[PDB]
Amino acid sequence: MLSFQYPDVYRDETAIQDYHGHKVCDPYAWLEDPDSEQTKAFVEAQNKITVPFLEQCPIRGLYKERMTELYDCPKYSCHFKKGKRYFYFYNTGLQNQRVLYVQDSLEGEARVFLDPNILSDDGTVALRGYAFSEDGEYFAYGLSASGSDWVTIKFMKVDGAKELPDVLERVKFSCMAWTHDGKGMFYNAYPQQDGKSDGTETSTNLHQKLYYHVLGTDQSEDILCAEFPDEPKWMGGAELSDDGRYVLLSIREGTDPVNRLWYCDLQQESNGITGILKWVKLIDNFEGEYDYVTNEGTVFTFKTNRHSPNYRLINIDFTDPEESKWKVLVPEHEKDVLEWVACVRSNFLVLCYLHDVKNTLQLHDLATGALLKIFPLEVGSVVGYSGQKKDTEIFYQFTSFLSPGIIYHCDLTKEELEPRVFREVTCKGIDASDYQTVQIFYPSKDGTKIPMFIVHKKGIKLDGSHPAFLYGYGGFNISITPNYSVSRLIFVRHMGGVLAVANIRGGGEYGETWHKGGILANKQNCFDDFQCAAEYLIKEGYTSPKRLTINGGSNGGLLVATCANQRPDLFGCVIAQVGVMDMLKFHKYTIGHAWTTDYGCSDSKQHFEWLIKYSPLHNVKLPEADDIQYPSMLLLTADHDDRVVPLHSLKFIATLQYIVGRSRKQNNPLLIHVDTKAGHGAGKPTAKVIEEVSDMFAFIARCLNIDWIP
């Protein structure tokens, strides 16, 4: 099987660091410099062995072609209305980037408004964030190059789609909000830094500031409105109130669902926006999340987790703000998580709930919180929604494992609110008739029942003979809900596979207590939950260790790398995308300092003791048992991933190849592919997406020796 040899990779045996009396060697520390010839030569040598391995077998071509055929189907996003026009995103199917269209009415001719495809030859310039002026006549949009988190904000006049001279640089993790006078727009930017700012650098991002740009001026004239010079990690996101009277500032430090909430009454600014605003520090701590829904005068409605881990809606009156005075508008449910809330047609609230990892959508009265209407939905997820305060209608989009998607529309001016199918695209995709989705709850190591979705062909024999693809994430309060994936359905249909998604702790599926159950000292719970999911699939006869693949991206890449270290006997195949591998150093690079609320930080002796036990980079160990080797492993990363710097996967693969790959009993491949002109994932062109997943399933196919099923 293995007719290549791993590259010789220099070990710096002097690279030794003391962590609270514990010595740690880091012989591949030099891979932390993305600009060096050594690092670039390392990447080239790795790609040189991985690429022929993935492309040798005809099944890659078979998968790629089938995927291309199936993607070649027109896809619409949700409509939304802005000012007097309707907008939606559209892709004929294989366009590298989806295109923004505009029409004057719902039944009128649409035309191209913004087409990012014309901004590059290869589709690697992507739309990242946008904001219309309050009247919908002006348009700000972020552009990212090569998948980087770095953004350039450009501007258009909507009528005639006219490009304006205004350009904003050094924008990253920025909210964009226009004042209702139409004068200019708030946004975030970072101060000048040494070296590159194009996504290839590892430089930490600190001292994010809030600025206001007056339309028609140079960025150098922009007003500084808030900064936190004594708190370099703080990030302030601005948002105008629905009536245009208040700027709200949500200050975050880390990724926990908590924020400070300050406000500026813009009518109280002597001479407009001319400097640091008169911030009133309504919530001046990080004990809870306060997510603005709407206001009526000084009565502000927020979604909160303050003493309510499943979330609820409260009203805070700015003229009587003490916590004892807050009114609970919509109380917390015992089990169901309030995911999000929008205000539409003045006095309606749209609440989206998560009930056992499935969405329900409800309409409530703003004045009382009373339930008015349940929007009927099949089992799955709501993944698009539009409808703001002055709108008299909503669109929302439904998706699931076996359903390609339906966009609904509801006219909220009608006495009886019957929603209707607005759009469904009917292509001859995979026939889902012979497949089903089941939800089971399996016991973890500590007895906790964990949800898992299983997608498979009806009436399969549970004899352990099927290839299985087990997906997890497990962190940052993210819920992994049903989602249509062409790539996974090809695995099911043409590779005879079983798909599984485990809703392990760390996620938000059962609210903040689910999240806390999988972070910090309890991070091991995530790994136990996921290994227990694998054991469930095997024990129930869905699959066998040698037929089982696990996959995760980002925090999920960490998940699968750890499970490979901890239970190599349990998996045949492991695909870790853009994973955090160095748990001792992650905080030093770009935005990694923000994840310490989930992971902890190695500067603390306590935290170090948790991290060292699971840090994938520090736990690569040849299995003791003579009959156990590491599973086949593929790491996927990219050279402009400045979310999770590629040095994570670089050092980890060098480590796998030295510690395990050198052993004569290791015959399973341990490989990395580093893509170019790509980043963490968002805005990746369709062409690169197809390349990547074709690589993944080709890797699976040949390591399991699977026949394509026509």
XYZ file of C-alpha atoms in Angstrom:
710
model
C 0.000 0.000 0.000
C 2.691 2.534 1.035
C 5.154 3.115 -1.828
C 6.456 6.485 -0.621
C 8.755 7.532 2.214
C 8.312 10.340 4.745
C 10.617 13.344 4.365
C 13.501 13.813 6.778
C 12.496 16.664 9.035
C 15.026 18.446 11.176
C 14.533 18.133 14.943
C 15.646 21.075 17.083
C 16.558 19.110 20.218
C 17.482 22.377 22.038
C 13.869 23.632 21.899
C 12.976 22.917 25.537
C 10.524 24.891 27.670
C 9.698 24.600 31.348
C 5.958 24.689 32.097
C 5.632 24.882 35.922
C 8.467 22.369 36.454
C 7.384 20.160 33.538
C 9.902 20.162 30.677
C 8.426 20.095 27.170
C 10.488 19.558 24.024
C 9.203 21.185 20.848
C 11.667 20.002 18.157
C 9.502 21.287 15.267
C 9.088 24.805 16.712
C 10.731 26.199 13.559
C 7.552 25.298 11.601
C 5.945 28.230 13.465
C 7.609 30.573 10.951
C 5.386 30.484 7.850
C 7.787 32.720 5.868
C 11.011 30.683 6.142
C 12.457 28.583 3.326
C 12.629 25.646 5.786
C 8.837 25.815 6.357
C 8.009 26.184 2.674
C 10.331 23.306 1.763
C 8.622 21.232 4.506
C 5.172 21.973 3.061
C 6.315 21.147 -0.530
C 7.862 17.799 0.560
C 4.627 16.802 2.343
C 2.291 17.771 -0.511
C 4.642 15.887 -2.866
C 3.806 12.558 -1.163
C 0.165 13.237 -0.260
C -1.093 14.456 -3.641
C -0.144 11.326 -5.701
C -1.539 9.194 -2.852
C -4.984 10.885 -3.063
C -5.080 11.081 -6.894
C -3.719 7.583 -7.819
C -7.045 5.774 -7.468
C -9.880 6.099 -9.996
C -12.456 6.422 -7.205
C -11.338 10.042 -6.611
C -12.366 10.872 -10.190
C -15.609 8.938 -9.748
C -16.436 10.886 -6.576
C -15.368 14.238 -8.044
C -17.509 13.764 -11.185
C -20.575 12.622 -9.210
C -20.140 15.552 -6.851
C -19.821 18.000 -9.751
C -22.975 16.611 -11.397
C -24.903 16.868 -8.107
C -23.660 20.407 -7.297
C -24.716 21.500 -10.772
C -28.165 22.544 -9.556
C -29.377 26.145 -9.076
C -29.373 27.265 -5.420
C -31.237 30.254 -3.917
C -30.772 31.888 -0.516
C -33.406 33.733 1.430
C -34.880 36.890 0.126
C -34.587 39.905 2.324
C -35.927 43.391 1.780
C -33.837 46.542 2.131
C -35.467 49.917 1.636
C -37.645 49.527 -1.420
C -35.865 46.521 -2.987
C -35.647 42.759 -2.601
C -32.322 40.908 -2.525
C -31.225 37.275 -2.588
C -28.142 35.192 -3.216
C -28.052 32.764 -6.115
C -25.716 30.198 -7.653
C -26.378 28.314 -10.916
C -24.622 25.492 -9.041
C -20.909 25.462 -9.822
C -20.091 29.186 -9.612
C -17.149 29.638 -7.278
C -19.049 32.331 -5.329
C -22.786 32.913 -4.956
C -24.070 36.145 -6.466
C -26.217 38.873 -4.885
C -29.289 39.779 -6.982
C -31.680 42.709 -6.683
C -35.303 43.175 -7.829
C -37.804 46.013 -7.328
C -40.596 43.687 -6.307
C -41.100 40.010 -5.531
C -42.659 39.324 -8.969
C -40.198 41.522 -10.916
C -37.079 41.000 -13.030
C -33.929 40.355 -11.025
C -30.498 41.654 -11.926
C -26.956 41.090 -10.700
C -26.153 43.508 -7.869
C -22.815 42.116 -6.619
C -20.876 39.316 -8.367
C -17.697 38.384 -6.483
C -16.717 35.936 -9.263
C -15.489 38.815 -11.413
C -13.099 39.885 -8.628
C -10.640 37.000 -9.254
C -9.727 34.275 -11.766
C -10.012 31.402 -9.296
C -12.867 32.531 -7.030
C -10.586 33.304 -4.043
C -11.975 36.785 -3.368
C -15.092 36.354 -1.277
C -17.812 38.452 0.307
C -17.331 38.545 4.089
C -19.963 40.624 5.900
C -22.198 43.391 4.561
C -24.503 46.177 5.800
C -27.072 48.318 4.005
C -27.716 51.861 5.126
C -30.983 52.168 7.023
C -32.840 53.492 3.936
C -31.345 50.673 1.815
C -29.819 53.147 -0.675
C -26.169 52.470 0.249
C -24.226 49.232 0.689
C -21.048 48.362 2.578
C -19.444 44.964 2.005
C -16.337 43.173 3.199
C -14.018 41.393 0.785
C -11.536 38.713 1.855
C -8.681 37.423 -0.269
C -7.482 33.777 -0.162
C -9.772 32.865 2.719
C -8.160 35.235 5.237
C -10.139 36.735 8.165
C -8.715 40.113 7.050
C -11.274 42.244 5.259
C -11.378 45.336 3.068
C -14.675 47.219 3.293
C -15.878 48.758 0.041
C -19.044 50.771 -0.667
C -21.734 50.988 -3.383
C -24.691 53.259 -4.091
C -27.541 50.748 -4.577
C -29.355 52.584 -7.426
C -27.251 51.773 -10.521
C -24.890 49.640 -8.389
C -22.320 52.447 -8.389
C -18.888 51.856 -6.841
C -17.777 54.574 -4.415
C -14.170 55.584 -3.565
C -14.522 54.702 0.160
C -12.195 51.882 1.280
C -11.557 50.682 4.829
C -8.451 48.650 5.668
C -7.254 46.609 8.677
C -10.746 45.278 9.321
C -11.150 41.954 11.128
C -13.930 40.522 13.382
C -15.937 43.659 12.702
C -19.622 44.481 13.025
C -20.899 46.990 10.430
C -23.734 49.379 11.384
C -24.893 52.642 9.780
C -26.398 55.535 11.739
C -29.993 56.219 10.644
C -29.055 59.741 9.467
C -27.173 57.925 6.672
C -24.017 59.929 7.461
C -21.572 57.075 8.057
C -20.986 53.657 9.536
C -19.409 52.036 12.609
C -16.839 49.274 12.140
C -13.871 47.661 13.912
C -10.208 47.839 12.989
C -6.819 46.817 14.368
C -3.825 49.188 14.747
C -0.867 48.986 12.340
C 1.370 45.974 12.927
C 4.845 44.920 11.762
C 5.147 42.369 8.930
C 2.334 41.066 6.719
C -1.431 41.340 7.257
C -2.664 39.032 4.486
C -3.518 35.841 6.370
C -0.104 34.125 6.207
C 1.141 35.799 9.412
C 0.773 34.409 12.977
C 0.834 37.800 14.731
C -1.569 38.037 17.670
C -4.537 40.375 17.210
C -4.908 42.828 20.071
C -6.220 46.381 20.687
C -9.259 46.170 18.421
C -10.909 49.573 18.218
C -14.318 50.909 17.244
C -14.369 53.559 14.492
C -16.969 55.607 12.644
C -16.476 56.291 8.937
C -18.223 59.305 7.390
C -19.167 58.360 3.833
C -17.191 60.356 1.227
C -14.025 60.753 3.319
C -10.662 59.009 3.687
C -10.301 56.300 6.359
C -7.579 58.440 7.971
C -10.367 60.902 8.952
C -12.389 58.198 10.777
C -13.512 58.988 14.326
C -12.312 56.765 17.213
C -15.443 56.001 19.261
C -14.252 53.338 21.753
C -10.983 51.639 22.657
C -9.851 49.538 25.616
C -6.077 50.252 25.899
C -5.863 48.547 29.341
C -7.758 45.489 28.067
C -6.036 44.436 24.792
C -8.237 41.319 24.283
C -11.578 43.158 24.541
C -13.578 43.470 21.327
C -16.484 45.932 21.029
C -19.206 45.184 18.492
C -21.579 48.072 17.720
C -25.216 47.939 16.663
C -27.824 50.695 16.181
C -31.146 50.319 17.979
C -34.163 49.767 15.615
C -35.316 53.377 16.075
C -31.781 54.722 15.350
C -31.489 56.430 18.720
C -28.867 54.302 20.520
C -25.540 52.717 19.633
C -25.241 49.504 21.606
C -21.768 48.185 22.349
C -21.311 44.459 23.047
C -17.856 43.952 24.478
C -16.462 40.455 24.394
C -13.310 38.907 25.780
C -13.001 35.297 24.698
C -15.625 33.082 23.065
C -17.985 32.443 26.026
C -21.607 33.540 25.436
C -21.221 36.595 27.704
C -20.784 40.329 26.974
C -20.647 43.737 28.607
C -23.379 45.975 27.247
C -22.827 49.723 26.978
C -25.004 52.229 25.148
C -24.721 55.726 23.738
C -27.822 57.877 23.382
C -26.910 59.612 20.104
C -29.311 62.509 20.761
C -27.144 63.279 23.795
C -24.022 63.801 21.665
C -23.484 67.583 21.724
C -22.193 67.878 18.150
C -22.810 64.467 16.517
C -20.122 61.759 16.466
C -16.828 63.626 16.963
C -14.812 61.523 19.445
C -15.052 58.934 22.216
C -18.829 58.627 22.771
C -20.616 59.154 26.110
C -20.909 55.434 26.893
C -23.380 54.499 29.598
C -22.132 51.242 31.064
C -25.437 49.410 31.575
C -23.918 45.936 32.065
C -20.294 46.382 33.080
C -19.207 42.741 33.612
C -18.909 39.368 31.803
C -21.427 37.396 33.906
C -24.026 37.057 31.155
C -24.955 37.430 27.520
C -27.237 40.276 26.423
C -28.309 40.047 22.811
C -30.375 42.977 21.517
C -33.772 42.053 20.044
C -35.614 45.380 19.828
C -36.625 48.404 21.892
C -39.709 50.540 22.445
C -38.464 53.849 23.767
C -36.212 53.085 26.734
C -37.584 49.535 27.185
C -34.997 47.203 25.662
C -35.731 43.537 24.942
C -32.710 41.183 25.201
C -32.166 37.473 24.815
C -30.062 36.439 27.783
C -28.530 33.456 29.556
C -28.304 35.374 32.843
C -29.425 32.745 35.399
C -30.949 30.862 32.476
C -28.635 28.436 30.691
C -31.357 27.514 28.153
C -31.896 31.268 27.470
C -34.895 33.593 27.807
C -36.127 37.074 26.893
C -35.972 39.965 29.348
C -36.960 43.660 29.179
C -34.534 46.158 30.687
C -35.810 49.709 31.013
C -32.815 52.072 30.648
C -34.585 54.579 32.951
C -34.951 51.898 35.671
C -32.110 49.457 34.988
C -31.454 47.589 38.311
C -31.618 43.798 37.833
C -34.582 43.434 40.259
C -36.621 45.655 37.895
C -36.112 43.508 34.768
C -39.296 41.962 33.396
C -39.105 38.386 32.112
C -40.990 38.604 28.802
C -40.492 34.966 27.733
C -39.289 32.657 30.514
C -36.683 29.940 30.172
C -37.776 26.470 29.070
C -36.637 23.498 31.206
C -34.983 21.727 28.284
C -35.421 23.615 24.972
C -32.815 26.208 24.046
C -33.922 29.591 22.711
C -31.386 29.817 19.856
C -32.299 33.234 18.457
C -35.038 35.873 18.309
C -35.971 38.557 15.735
C -38.470 41.405 15.880
C -40.628 41.930 12.811
C -43.615 44.063 11.768
C -43.213 46.332 14.844
C -44.689 44.076 17.526
C -44.067 40.428 16.535
C -41.248 38.270 17.871
C -39.945 35.274 15.926
C -38.410 32.746 18.312
C -36.292 29.858 17.116
C -36.006 26.981 19.574
C -33.845 23.866 19.619
C -35.761 20.814 20.888
C -33.555 17.693 21.043
C -31.242 19.091 18.320
C -34.120 20.025 15.951
C -35.566 23.524 15.315
C -39.082 24.808 15.951
C -40.143 28.317 14.841
C -42.719 30.402 16.767
C -44.332 33.826 16.551
C -44.929 35.727 19.781
C -46.474 39.050 20.794
C -43.848 41.646 21.822
C -46.048 43.312 24.448
C -46.826 40.128 26.421
C -44.506 37.354 25.171
C -47.647 35.314 24.356
C -47.384 32.546 21.751
C -49.403 33.460 18.657
C -48.421 30.993 15.935
C -46.320 27.890 15.308
C -44.639 27.702 11.930
C -44.837 24.062 10.812
C -41.510 22.403 9.979
C -40.301 18.882 9.267
C -37.425 17.498 11.379
C -34.288 19.570 10.709
C -32.842 23.073 10.951
C -33.849 26.636 10.141
C -30.781 28.061 8.374
C -31.882 31.345 6.860
C -34.236 33.977 8.218
C -35.060 37.519 7.222
C -37.498 39.989 8.767
C -36.582 43.108 10.715
C -38.711 45.607 12.686
C -40.094 47.607 9.756
C -40.664 44.538 7.527
C -44.209 43.162 7.186
C -43.056 39.697 6.080
C -40.548 36.936 6.799
C -38.617 34.384 4.769
C -36.972 31.365 6.379
C -35.174 28.336 5.027
C -35.458 24.711 6.126
C -32.763 22.075 5.752
C -32.097 18.495 6.910
C -29.856 15.480 6.164
C -32.191 14.224 3.417
C -33.855 17.476 2.285
C -32.012 19.881 -0.057
C -33.948 22.860 1.304
C -37.167 24.846 1.085
C -37.521 28.618 1.429
C -40.793 29.719 3.021
C -42.486 33.113 2.944
C -45.141 34.570 5.237
C -47.101 37.821 4.815
C -47.485 39.186 8.360
C -50.124 41.808 7.418
C -52.776 39.074 7.055
C -55.176 38.297 9.919
C -54.369 34.598 9.509
C -50.649 34.004 9.080
C -50.417 31.116 6.625
C -46.814 30.575 5.535
C -46.213 29.306 1.994
C -43.481 27.548 0.065
C -41.751 30.404 -1.738
C -38.986 28.390 -3.313
C -37.903 24.799 -3.722
C -35.437 23.756 -6.410
C -36.261 20.418 -7.992
C -33.132 18.661 -9.311
C -32.639 14.945 -9.954
C -30.180 14.562 -7.052
C -29.741 11.517 -4.820
C -33.027 9.670 -4.265
C -33.548 9.917 -0.469
C -36.602 7.598 -0.501
C -34.512 4.556 0.466
C -32.779 6.398 3.323
C -33.785 7.398 6.834
C -32.561 9.567 9.695
C -32.821 8.186 13.247
C -32.010 9.916 16.525
C -30.651 7.791 19.362
C -29.300 8.672 22.806
C -26.252 6.689 23.909
C -24.670 6.542 27.372
C -21.258 8.154 27.786
C -18.564 6.946 30.176
C -20.158 8.840 33.104
C -23.706 7.670 32.217
C -24.745 10.946 30.512
C -27.090 10.326 27.569
C -25.723 11.875 24.375
C -27.819 12.532 21.228
C -26.674 11.037 17.907
C -28.230 11.309 14.422
C -27.730 8.293 12.166
C -28.416 8.419 8.430
C -28.550 5.092 6.569
C -30.322 3.004 3.926
C -33.573 1.427 5.076
C -33.408 -2.245 6.071
C -29.613 -2.626 6.222
C -28.346 -5.628 8.159
C -26.720 -4.589 11.425
C -23.764 -6.980 10.956
C -20.919 -4.430 11.364
C -20.015 -4.601 7.654
C -20.766 -0.999 6.614
C -18.327 1.886 6.282
C -19.298 4.687 8.663
C -18.496 8.385 8.795
C -18.771 9.797 12.313
C -18.754 13.567 12.673
C -18.281 15.696 15.799
C -17.331 19.194 16.928
C -17.900 19.569 20.694
C -17.203 23.120 21.820
C -17.817 26.861 21.909
C -21.547 26.435 22.464
C -22.013 25.352 18.830
C -24.969 23.044 18.159
C -24.546 20.511 15.330
C -28.023 20.331 13.798
C -29.279 18.525 10.638
C -27.892 19.903 7.383
C -28.015 18.836 3.723
C -24.654 17.595 2.530
C -24.245 16.307 -1.035
C -20.762 15.032 -0.147
C -21.987 12.849 2.730
C -24.912 11.501 0.687
C -22.507 10.346 -2.038
C -20.711 8.450 0.760
C -24.054 6.890 1.702
C -25.285 6.124 -1.849
C -22.129 5.339 -3.813
C -19.871 4.059 -1.034
C -22.531 2.136 0.949
C -21.821 4.145 4.068
C -23.566 5.108 7.271
C -23.435 8.741 8.407
C -23.393 9.657 12.095
C -23.341 12.986 13.936
C -22.743 12.917 17.691
C -24.010 15.887 19.731
C -21.234 15.660 22.346
C -20.767 18.029 25.317
C -19.042 21.372 24.734
C -21.765 22.162 22.191
C -24.862 24.257 22.842
C -27.510 21.551 22.180
C -28.643 21.525 25.838
C -27.682 25.116 26.603
C -24.878 26.560 28.696
C -24.678 23.486 30.989
C -24.067 21.314 27.894
C -21.327 23.802 26.939
C -19.735 23.866 30.433
C -19.880 20.045 30.414
C -17.219 20.059 27.678
C -14.689 22.845 28.446
C -11.721 23.548 30.746
C -11.247 20.766 33.324
C -14.141 18.863 31.663
C -12.772 18.924 28.106
C -12.043 15.163 28.398
C -15.858 14.694 28.438
C -15.945 15.645 24.734
C -13.418 12.978 23.864
C -15.145 10.360 26.059
C -18.533 11.226 24.494
C -17.120 10.869 20.964
C -15.240 7.601 21.623
C -18.472 6.332 23.237
C -20.364 7.246 20.042
C -17.911 5.105 18.036
C -18.404 2.233 20.530
C -22.193 2.576 20.088
C -22.011 2.289 16.272
C -19.732 -0.772 16.591
C -21.700 -2.475 19.393
C -25.047 -2.000 17.567
C -23.574 -3.447 14.369
C -23.596 -0.331 12.168
C -19.840 -0.674 11.477
C -16.501 -2.055 12.777
C -13.288 -0.315 13.943
C -11.519 -0.911 10.589
C -14.539 0.408 8.626
C -14.988 3.521 10.765
C -13.912 7.014 9.753
C -13.997 10.042 12.058
C -14.000 13.674 10.898
C -13.984 17.108 12.548
C -12.880 20.649 11.657
C -11.273 23.384 13.795
C -12.171 22.517 17.444
C -13.484 19.324 15.736
C -10.037 18.676 14.233
C -8.718 18.751 17.809
C -11.492 16.262 18.727
C -10.505 13.629 16.155
C -6.723 14.031 16.631
C -7.172 13.449 20.364
C -9.355 10.379 19.805
C -6.700 8.997 17.417
C -4.109 9.384 20.231
C -6.364 7.983 22.936
C -8.156 5.155 21.108
C -6.220 4.183 17.933
C -7.839 0.717 18.119
C -11.295 2.219 17.622
C -10.830 3.905 14.214
C -9.804 2.856 10.738
C -9.536 6.386 9.364
C -9.185 9.956 10.694
C -9.625 13.242 8.818
C -8.811 16.379 10.820
C -9.503 19.674 9.071
C -7.861 22.926 10.203
C -7.428 21.572 13.731
C -5.943 23.145 16.849
C -3.113 20.736 17.731
C -0.720 22.669 19.972
C -2.759 23.229 23.146
C 0.214 24.792 24.966
C 0.837 27.538 22.390
C -2.524 28.153 20.641
C -3.064 31.442 22.525
C 0.054 33.106 21.055
C -1.244 33.308 17.482
C -3.706 35.613 15.708
C -7.085 35.274 17.457
C -6.210 32.140 19.466
C -6.193 34.162 22.729
C -10.018 34.183 22.450
C -10.309 30.394 22.943
C -8.879 30.277 26.491
C -12.445 30.462 27.833
C -13.048 27.018 26.301
C -9.598 25.484 26.619
C -7.782 27.282 29.474
C -4.256 28.770 29.076
C -0.934 27.006 29.704
C 0.425 29.991 31.727
C -1.683 28.593 34.559
C -0.302 25.509 36.332
C -3.852 24.132 36.819
C -4.795 24.625 33.151
C -1.467 23.178 31.964
C -2.254 19.962 33.875
C -5.544 19.600 31.937
C -4.056 20.550 28.541
C -0.954 18.339 28.620
C -3.076 15.197 28.983
C -4.932 15.713 25.667
C -2.879 18.180 23.551
C -2.601 16.157 20.318
C 0.944 17.411 19.643
C 2.158 16.143 23.074
C 0.393 12.775 23.139
C 1.549 11.027 19.954
C 2.597 7.644 21.333
C 3.193 4.340 19.563
C 0.568 1.900 20.945
C 1.970 -0.745 23.312
C -0.041 -3.683 21.927
C 1.757 -5.507 19.070
C -1.448 -5.671 17.005
C -2.389 -1.969 17.287
C -1.107 0.829 15.052
C -2.332 4.379 14.427
C -5.336 4.730 12.080
C -4.819 6.178 8.600
C -4.679 9.934 9.129
C -5.140 12.936 6.881
C -4.682 16.514 8.068
C -6.114 19.260 5.897
C -5.075 22.873 6.282
C -4.274 25.861 4.041
C -1.628 28.580 3.862
C -3.918 31.581 4.597
C -5.760 29.990 7.538
C -5.229 32.777 10.027
C -8.070 31.510 12.221
C -6.170 28.360 13.221
C -2.590 28.951 12.078
C -1.304 26.019 9.911
C 1.726 25.522 12.194
C -0.709 23.423 14.301
C -1.095 20.757 11.579
C 2.523 21.200 10.383
C 4.099 20.359 13.775
C 1.546 17.617 14.409
C 2.288 15.750 11.151
C 6.081 15.978 11.687
C 5.365 14.503 15.126
C 3.092 11.700 13.833
C 5.620 10.775 11.151
C 8.589 10.700 13.563
C 7.011 9.145 16.668
C 4.741 6.617 14.908
C 5.429 6.657 11.128
C 9.029 5.428 11.639
C 7.869 2.204 13.352
C 7.856 -0.976 11.231
C 4.401 -1.966 12.547
C 2.881 1.303 11.263
C 1.560 0.633 7.741
C -1.347 3.110 7.779
C -0.437 6.439 6.087
C -0.051 9.651 8.135
C -0.404 12.536 5.692
C -1.019 16.260 5.409
C -2.246 18.387 2.553
C -1.712 22.130 2.618
C -3.890 24.006 0.146
C -2.899 27.400 -1.376
C -5.044 30.567 -1.589
C -7.404 29.136 1.027
C -7.980 29.644 4.736
C -10.100 28.295 7.567
C -13.046 27.546 5.274
C -15.450 30.474 4.978
C -15.725 31.870 1.449
C -13.785 28.919 -0.058
C -14.618 28.736 -3.810
C -16.844 25.885 -5.015
C -13.946 24.457 -7.072
C -11.702 24.086 -4.013
C -14.540 22.650 -1.952
C -15.050 19.890 -4.548
C -11.268 19.209 -4.714
C -11.069 18.938 -0.949
C -13.959 16.580 -0.278
C -12.933 14.425 -3.279
C -9.547 14.110 -1.530
C -11.218 13.172 1.776
C -13.422 10.430 0.385
C -10.657 9.134 -1.917
C -8.502 8.833 1.234
C -11.369 6.944 2.956
C -12.013 4.708 -0.070
C -8.460 3.461 -0.418
C -7.693 3.036 3.263
C -10.880 0.947 3.625
C -10.485 -0.583 0.118
C -14.095 0.392 -0.870
C -15.689 -0.281 -4.281
C -17.640 2.565 -5.888
C -21.324 1.622 -6.142
C -22.648 3.047 -9.448
